[PDB]
Amino acid sequence: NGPIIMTREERMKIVHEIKERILDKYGDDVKAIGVYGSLGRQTDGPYSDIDMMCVMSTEEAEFSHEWTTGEWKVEVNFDSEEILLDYASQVESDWPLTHGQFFSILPIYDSGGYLEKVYQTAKSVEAQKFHDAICALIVEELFEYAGKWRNIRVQGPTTFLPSLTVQVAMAGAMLIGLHHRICYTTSASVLTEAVKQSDLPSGYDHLCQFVMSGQLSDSEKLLESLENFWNGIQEWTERHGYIVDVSKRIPF
Amino acid sequence: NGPIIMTREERMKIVHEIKERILDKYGDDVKAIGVYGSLGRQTDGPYSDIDMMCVMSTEEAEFSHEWTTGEWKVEVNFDSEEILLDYASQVESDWPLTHGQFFSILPIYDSGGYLEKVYQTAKSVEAQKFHDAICALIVEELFEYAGKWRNIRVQGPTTFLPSLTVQVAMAGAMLIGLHHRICYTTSASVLTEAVKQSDLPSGYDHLCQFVMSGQLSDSEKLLESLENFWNGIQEWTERHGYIVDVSKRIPF
Ligand SMILES: [Cl-]
Ligand SMILES: [Cl-]
Ligand SMILES: [Cl-]
Ligand SMILES: [Mg+2]
Ligand SMILES: [Mg+2]
């Protein structure tokens, strides 16, 4: 019957039962246990799932348990300190979605500053990694999307244009979060938070208006908006120096 | 203002230049080079990008070159045979999207029949792997989405509902592709191809009509149709034997 309504109590009671089980099973190999996500921020909604992380001492440990009782769902990730610290300092295109984890840790067990080390690692990533991630996002995501909607314009199917427009708006939101080095709180707040940031590429606000209102049925207006945003991307990347040499056919 | 229009002949000229560069640069370390995707499928559209894969001899090789010339985009993935074969036989939630690569390989260089081995491996994945992927998709993706839209029903923001409904339709399309062990042709064809299939969960077609028409502005209607789809998922899993384990509070 899908997820049920739960109070914080009820979620925190579940969390501590899981914490006790984790300690019972893995003992001294457990360096720390934390809750993250909306429950970690104390902004969990009545229907939110439960996300937990466990820092292991064990060499190369990297596994997870994700399950449901039919009424709620839990995900517990287990990583060695070195693997987690490596992950916390890697900036991919979806860093604004994934790494909010590390700014929302509610520590529930910690044998010696491990969760603070994770947070410090996440918040200390050097600027070059964000610069590289943005340039890669332009190539690997937005340029590809531009080809996809131009293909739709000339050969269909327009039945994919609403979904593609949503994907472009989300990629634009990742671009904005990388530029400002800010992680979105929840996936539901991404567009709301993205359009509140400064220095957006032109055309992004208009695109997000279509996506947030759900008025995605006028294909000519969507293609116009996507092209306008794509033009804004060209101006924005040039203004901020997110440019690589593209003159050679083969750059290796 | 790329991507520009190119013919298939122009793309294959680019492809063979890149093949010559790879062989020039990496030499005897190159086992095979193939084109995949729409171009490998000879169904590339006027604006399609170029996707290439390279099997390397060094056992831990795993890198890529992805770039644009301003006018077109190329992605070349380099993997050792061992890494590629393992990846070709892994079935994740997005297998219907990602593993079409392995059924669209056009070999352009091959010193040992390596690309046929990759294809055979991808084709020979056991049915249990799809069963496990379906159960994981329901728990890890759909159950989470249900919580997100139920939270929206009671506390907003409805501005995320069009994007969430798109994500739910795509997850349903992965479920259908896993059930039929079929990879979608292009990402733009996913919804059209998923809804032509047999054995759809009840409510999925109705939900996809909103997403494909782009009529995503009526929030009550989307919430009703998501709930109906969620119910249809429950009946569909029982009919097809995809029983998710809900018996343990803590399964470790
Ligand atoms: Cl570019
Ligand atoms: Cl291209
Ligand atoms: Cl297998
Ligand atoms: Mg979650
Ligand atoms: Mg590509």
From Swiss-Prot, chains A, B:
GO terms for biological process: response to antibiotic. Homodimer. Its EC number is 2.7.7.-. The keyword Nucleotide-binding applies. The gene is knt. One of its GO terms (molecular function) is nucleotidyltransferase activity. Thermostable at 50 degrees Celsius for over 30 minutes, at 55 degrees Celsius for about 9 minutes. This is Aminoglycoside nucleotidyltransferase (4'). It holds the Pfam family KNTase_C. Inactivates aminoglycoside antibiotics such as kanamycin by catalyzing the transfer of a nucleotidyl group from nucleoside triphosphates such as (d)ATP to the 4'-hydroxyl group of the aminoglycoside. Keywords: Antibiotic resistance, ATP-binding, Nucleotide-binding, Plasmid, Transferase. It catalyses: kanamycin A + ATP = 4'-adenylylkanamycin A + diphosphate; amikacin + ATP = 4'-adenylylamikacin + diphosphate; neomycin B + ATP = 4'-adenylylneomycin B + diphosphate; paromomycin + ATP = 4'-adenylylparomomycin + diphosphate. It is an enzyme of class 2 (transferase). It comes from Bacillus sp.
